[PDB]
Amino acid sequence: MDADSLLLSLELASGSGQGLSPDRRASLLTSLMLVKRDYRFARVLFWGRILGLVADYYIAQGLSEDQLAPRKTLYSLNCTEWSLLPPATEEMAMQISVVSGRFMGDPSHEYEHTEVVVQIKEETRLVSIIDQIDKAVAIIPRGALFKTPFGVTHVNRTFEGLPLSEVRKLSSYFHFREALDSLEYDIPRGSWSIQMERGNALVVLRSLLWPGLTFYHAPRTKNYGYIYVGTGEKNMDLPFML
């Protein structure tokens, strides 16, 4: 999402199925500013929402400097209380390959596995899923992060939107994570749903690798943002459905 003008950045945006509500809207509008006040963040944006089974997660991603570091992730059972999440590594990314169940929505709930009986926390699996999503299907438009000679590439103020000749072009959208950035040369090459909701005023890219991620972008105004209202599953039957 974004940090200012949160009305046009819809939680639904005619996409991703579910979304937020007018019970979680104003609390998030104050909570992103409270996270930006507490933690030293340059920008803060609502990442998305994990479904769960008893409660949601309301994942907000707080961004540090240089726009490329493993930036901070925050979960919240209720939107007034916010906690931290550790930065993900490779071993917690490969430890979740044996579990494929749905999210529970409980921090005390642990997932068991017989390998000697071992247990894993819900929160490390949650931040591993979030890191896999932001390293897999996190997208930005062309020119949104311009190249700097010092090497920071924080915010491009020149970029006001994409012209009408490259909206349907999938290769124009770059990625937020490192491989300037990596364009849409992904492994299925058909894992993106490009739609035009209201004329040529809003383009919606729905992630087919992770069902529930909608990236809205306006071609004339610089308003781009991705929100994941999926359940965090990584369904490996994607070319079976394509």
Binding site: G19, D23, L53, R102
Partner: protein
């Protein structure tokens, strides 16, 4: 420009059906559906569909997500006017449709992409080749003529598969609170006397199904195709006995506007079908589905096992042939 072309076809919108805005406002509070700029355009699309067809009640069924364009779905019900031994293996009991408005074709589902575009009526689904082909899982490209393919030969051009998925969602997840649709067909109870929102949260047995469950035969009613005898959950049963895995519940319940106890509408989210939501406050309700038209599995979806290969003819006394007669048999038959 395509924007002016999609704006000029919406002029027929700005010129019976269930209130959609109130439901949208509740669904929005619930955290599902569409924002309050396109869910009004589908309300005027339902109003344009109601003024052109003899519809008793036209509900907004939801919006199936697609690749190029989504599938905005209506749910209408017409009043009176509707639309040496060779080849020993025959067809394996091809089952036709049940009826016009009784079985799985009880509601006609009109499907459009944009509300400015006219509605495309989905055909009536047949059980033996489209509903029993629920073991596939395919996306939608938003064309309705693309002739999508899967592991069995699908007799559809993306309208039949969408109709089968809509029938599965409307037969497995279209739910109503306990006290509605008393006794086949059903009629609404005049003595409903309300229901508690808290009782629809801690107790999952207060949400009856009210719709006929899709059998593995495909149709909702058995009809004796041999002249075996399978039946699932019947009409007016709670969702506490739904089939599923033990570690994931079949239905979860959250409360919209949790901070205020007085005014909270129970929200039902179907674990089995993502994007399907049911909201109740105490007197009214509406079912909804949004997102990809797909059934959730605990593991990832695998394609089904192939049918077993047919065995050949076994070595018996009939397949054994006599090679040649003896010399005594051919020299003694002319005498004896």
């Amino acid at each position: 420009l395509p924007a002016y072309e999609i704006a000029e076809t919406q002029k027929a919108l700005f010129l019976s059906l269930p209130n959609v805005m109130e439901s949208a406002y509740y669904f929005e509070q619930a955290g599902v559906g569409l924002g309050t700029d396109e869910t009004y355009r589908v309300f005027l699309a339902l109003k344009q569909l109601t003024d052109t067809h003899p519809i008793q009640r036209c509900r907004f069924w939801g919006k199936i997500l697609g690749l190029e364009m989504n599938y905005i779905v209506a749910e209408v019900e017409f009043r009176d006017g509707e639309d040496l031994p060779k080849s020993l293996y025959k067809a394996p009991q091809v089952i036709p449709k049940e009826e016009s408005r009784t079985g799985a074709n009880k509601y006609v589902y009109f499907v459009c992409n944009v509300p400015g575009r006219p509605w495309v009526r989905l055909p009536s689904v047949t059980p033996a080749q489209i509903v029993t082909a629920r073991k596939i899982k395919k996306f939608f490209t938003g064309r309705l003529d693309a002739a999508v393919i899967s592991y069995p030969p699908f007799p559809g051009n993306e309208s039949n598969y969408l109709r089968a998925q809509i029938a599965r969602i409307s037969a497995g997840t279209h739910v109503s609170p306990l006290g509605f649709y008393q006794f086949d067909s059903y009629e609404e109870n005049p003595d409903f006397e309300g229901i508690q929102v808290i009782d629809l949260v801690e107790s999952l047995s207060n949400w009856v199904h009210h719709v006929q469950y899709i059998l593995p035969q495909g149709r909702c009613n058995w009809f004796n195709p041999i002249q075996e005898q399978e039946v699932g959950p019947p009409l007016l049963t709670p969702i506490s006995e739904d089939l599923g895995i033990q570690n994931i519940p079949s239905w979860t319940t959250q409360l919209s506007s949790n901070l205020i106890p007085q005014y909270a509408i129970a929200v039902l989210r179907s674990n089995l079908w993502p994007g399907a939501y049911a909201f109740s406050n105490g007197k009214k309700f509406e079912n909804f589905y949004i997102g990809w038209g797909h059934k959730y599995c605990v593991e990832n979806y695998t394609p089904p096992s192939p049918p077993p290969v047919y065995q050949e003819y076994p070595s018996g006394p009939e397949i054994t042939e006599m090679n040649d007669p003896s010399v005594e048999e051919e020299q003694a038959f002319r005498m004896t």
